[PDB]
């Protein structure tokens, strides 16, 4: 949280107009005299340009900054401008090179109008009454026809999942979701209570449909489940998996949420990976944990960190570590692509949810991955009543998202 | 537009068409539309659409489809907001229900012709033998957008061959705080980038 503060409370303010940056000083008494502005342009994580400019703004003043002609490539992707204010010299409370402020903008987008290279190969579908198998190369994917989930996958002789890939609509309650609700004295208004009461945490799936079809150049799986509790259908998930000659699966998901059920904490999938890698690399917001109503301090870019850093050791364990606006995530040989929020650690939601202290958590078999098409905000106006603003509640009813899972 | 792809595939119990276009202007791709039509034994087509809007292009007024129908019917019946013209930043007075009115009533004779007659939150619309189902906003009259756009007065409009139908997955707000500067609030601007929608067209 500390960063979100730091950024919001920063003393310099920016506005971008064309290729001119307007800087506003919120200092009342001092002049920007230990301040440098670093600027920089990059295309999907790739740096194309940098500058540095000394700030000469008086308290309550403005400074105009015109940027050099900015490169612009043919390549697809998003072009982002990022600026940082630096304190070149040390003060009594800061080191040299301390960053006092920052801001970023999206400059342009070159949309990708390029269709992939027609698959050399073609996947084979092997049916059975238990499942559908897809093979292509060393790669194989299995979908269980009884459950409707992708139960396993192999690269070579190695299995990748410990747990099937499945829909997730809940979260290990944050302090704010709980509020002052106790086992003794239940607060029926607390998000958790609502969710609890409505069956979110204990709803059971229901295969409505599960089919395989052979396309000209790919296999197409199609499923549908209903989550229900006491004969009430809470949600409905409709997917399509489409594996192609490239050995890429494209998941497309479409949820329907009942108008009359408390809005879900989230909407995405999760699964337990078999692997355990040392780093995580992604192209999205970061580097730090960021939620929807708490992500202004985060920057879009390519981040690479140790797994350990993707977990936030809140003494009272709960959902944590999320990173939003992710476009690509890489872990081991996996790579997922799209627009989603995600989190990844060695602790299942359930373990988090069931441990009173962080010191009692134990790392699980592999890596737990939660990939969200959507996530509700965290709130915080107070911690004893619902504080999540409406804009951050998953109240649309219809939700759509897509992924591309693949390997390297 | 630009055909990027167009394929037919045969499914166990249906046909599946798949397309992709790019709209561009001066080598800039503004939008990208990706659909799938899926016709089944029921003789129902399900359209599924997915638009990508360039971050750096003014947000579009809308996002949907249109076409000119050959038929011309006397009534329009729908299940959604109405009965009156309603836009996104202007629909609190409207009620969700089943409305049935004369075609004539689906056009708003603003003396200075412009986009009009929209009805939001529609779940089902019926015109002649057609029935469309989903979640969309729509409008329907005898005037193309172009005709509206090119006529200074309403008295000069002429009804066109059949019925023009505009079905929107999304529509930007109308504004009004004032009429001499942009007045559409941000919440009503189509600024997401990624837009998804689906329809079911069929007959009775």
Minimum distance, in Å, between the CA of residue B72 and any CA atom of chain A: 33
> Rounded to whole angstroms, how far apart are CA atoms A283 and A291?
16
Q: Which residues of chain B does A398 touch, with a Cβ-Cβ cutoff of 8 Å?
A: 135
Which of B9, B11, B52 is opposite residue A111, by nearest beta carbon? B52
Give Cα A269 distance to the centre of its chain.
11
Q: Are residues A74 and A199 in the same domain?
A: no
CB B120 within 8 A of CB B88: yes
Minimum distance, in Å, between the CA of residue A109 and any CA atom of chain B: 6
Q: Are residues A182 and A225 in the same domain?
A: yes
Q: Which residues of chain A does B199 touch, with a Cβ-Cβ cutoff of 8 Å?
A: none
> Rounded to whole angstroms, how far apart are CA atoms A252 and A269?
11
Residue holding tokens 């086992």? Answer: A183
> Rounded to whole angstroms, how far apart are CA atoms B106 and A118?
47
Minimum distance, in Å, between the CA of residue A204 and any CA atom of chain B: 27
> Rounded to whole angstroms, how far apart are CA atoms A321 and A340?
14
Q: Are residues A156 and A205 in the same domain?
A: yes
3-class DSSP string for chain A: CHHHHHHHCCCEEEEEECCEEEEEECCCCCCCCCCEEEEEEEECCEEEEEEEEECCCCCCCEEEEECCCCCCCCCCEEEEEEEEEEECCCCCCCCCCEEEEEEEEEEEEECCCCCCCCCCCCCEEEECCCEEEEEECCEEEEEECCCCCEEEEEECCEECEEEEEEEECCCCCCHHHHCCCCCCCCCCCCHHHHHHHHCHHHCECCEEEEEEEECCCEEEEEEEEEEEECCEEEEEEEEEEEEECCCCEEEEEEEEECCCCCCCCEEEEEEEECCCCCEEEEEEEECCCCECCECCCCEEEEEEEEHHHHCCCCCCCCCCCCEEEEEEEEECCEEEEEEEEEEEECCCHHHHHHCCCHHHCCCCCCEEEEEEEEECCCCCCCCCCCCCCHHHCCCCCEEEEEEEEEEC
First to last CA, chain B: 33
Q: Are residues A270 and A189 in the same domain?
A: yes
Search chain A and give the residue with CA nearest B197: A400
- Domain membership of residue A5 (yes or no) is no
Strands (E), B26-152: 28-40, 45-53, 62-69, 75-82, 95-102, 119-127, 130-141
In terms of DSSP bridges, do strands B119-127 and B75-82 run parallel, antiparallel, or are they unpaired?
antiparallel
Q: Are residues A290 and A211 in the same domain?
A: yes
Closest CA to A312 of A303, A321, A322, A323: A321
- CA-CA-CA-CA dihedral for A48, A51, A57, A59, to nearest 10: 60
Q: Are residues A314 and A401 in the same domain?
A: yes
Q: Are residues A244 and A189 in the same domain?
A: yes
| Method used to solve the structure | X-ray
Write out the binding residues of B for substrate. 180
Over the range A326-353, which residues count as b (16 or more CB within 10 Å of their CB) and which as e? bbbbbbbebbbbbbbbbbbbbbbbebbb
Closest CA to A263 of A389, A403, A401: A389
A336 is annotated as contributing to ligand binding? no
Q: What is the CATH number of the domain that holds B35?
A: 2.70.98.10
Inter-chain touch B52–A213, beta carbons under 8 Å: no
Q: Are residues A214 and A68 in the same domain?
A: no
Q: Which residues of chain A does B196 touch, with a Cβ-Cβ cutoff of 8 Å?
A: 400
SS3 B149: helix
Inter-chain touch B55–A211, beta carbons under 8 Å: no
Q: Are residues A47 and A189 in the same domain?
A: no
Residue A316: CB atoms within 10 Å: 13
Residues forming a β-bridge with A232: A229
Inter-chain touch B4–A398, beta carbons under 8 Å: no
Which of B24, B32, B55 is opposite residue A78, by nearest beta carbon? B55
Q: Are residues A83 and A128 in the same domain?
A: no
Q: Are residues A110 and A18 in the same domain?
A: yes
Closest CA to B68 of B150, B167, B151: B167
Residues of A with CB under 8 A from a CB of B: 78, 106-111, 113, 115, 211, 213, 215-216, 339, 398, 400
Given A95, A115, A135, the domain boundary residue is: A115
Inter-chain touch B22–A107, beta carbons under 8 Å: no
- Domain membership of residue A1 (yes or no) is no
- Domain membership of residue A3 (yes or no) is no
Residues forming a β-bridge with A289: none
Q: Are residues A273 and A400 in the same domain?
A: yes
Which tokens is A142 given? 């299995």
- Domain membership of residue A330 (yes or no) is yes
Please tell me the total count of domains within chain B. 1
Closest CA to A140 of A129, A155, A126: A155
> Rounded to whole angstroms, how far apart are CA atoms B59 and B194?
12
Structural domain for A348, as ranges: 116-408
Q: What is the CATH number of the domain that holds A63?
A: 2.60.40.10
């Amino acid at each position: 949280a500390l960063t979100e503060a730091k950024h919001q409370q920063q003393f310099f303010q920016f506005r971008l107009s064309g290729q001119t940056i307007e800087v506003t000083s919120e200092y009342l008494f001092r002049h920007s005299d230990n301040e440098l502005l670093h600027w920089m342009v990059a295309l999907d994580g790739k740096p194309l340009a940098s500058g540095e400019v000394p700030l000469d703004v008086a308290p309550q003043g403005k400074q105009l900054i015109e940027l050099p002609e900015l490169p612009q490539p043919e390549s697809a992707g998003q072009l982002w401008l990022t600026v940082r204010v630096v304190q070149p010299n040390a003060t009594a409370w800061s080191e040299a090179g301390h960053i006092s402020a920052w801001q970023q903008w999206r400059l342009a987008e070159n949309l990708s109008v390029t269709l992939p290279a027609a698959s050399h190969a073609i996947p084979h579908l092997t049916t059975s009454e238990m499942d559908f198998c897809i093979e292509l190369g060393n790669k194989r994917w299995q979908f269980n026809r009884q459950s409707g989930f992708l139960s396993q996958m192999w690269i070579g002789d190695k299995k990748q999942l410990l747990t099937p890939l499945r829909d997730q609509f809940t979260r290990a309650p944050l302090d704010n979701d709980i509020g002052v609700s106790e086992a003794t004295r239940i607060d029926p208004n607390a998000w958790v209570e609502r969710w609890k009461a409505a069956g979110h945490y204990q709803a059971e799936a229901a295969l409505l449909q599960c089919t395989a079809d052979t396309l000209a150049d790919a296999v197409l799986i199609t499923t549908a489940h209903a989550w229900q509790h006491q004969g009430k259908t809470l949600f409905i998930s409709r997917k399509t998996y489409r594996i192609d000659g490239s050995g890429q699966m494209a998941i497309t998901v479409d949820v329907e949420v009942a108008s009359d059920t408390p809005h879900p904490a989230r909407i995405g999938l999760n699964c337990q990976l078999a692997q355990v890698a040392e780093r995580v690399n992604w192209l999205g917001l970061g580097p730090q944990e960021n939620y929807p109503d708490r992500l202004t301090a985060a920057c879009f870019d390519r981040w690479d960190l140790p797994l350990s850093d993707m977990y936030t050791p809140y003494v009272f364990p709960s959902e944590n570590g999320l990173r939003c606006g992710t476009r690509e995530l890489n872990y081991g040989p996996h790579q997922w692509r799209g627009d989603f929020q995600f989190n990844i650690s060695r602790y299942s939601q359930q373990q988090l949810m069931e441990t009173s202290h962080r010191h009692l958590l134990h790392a699980e078999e592999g890596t737990w991955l939660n990939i969200d098409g959507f996530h509700m905000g965290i709130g915080g106006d107070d911690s004893w009543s619902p504080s999540v603003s409406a804009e951050f509640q998953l109240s649309a009813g219809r939700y759509h998202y897509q992924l591309v899972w693949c390997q390297k």
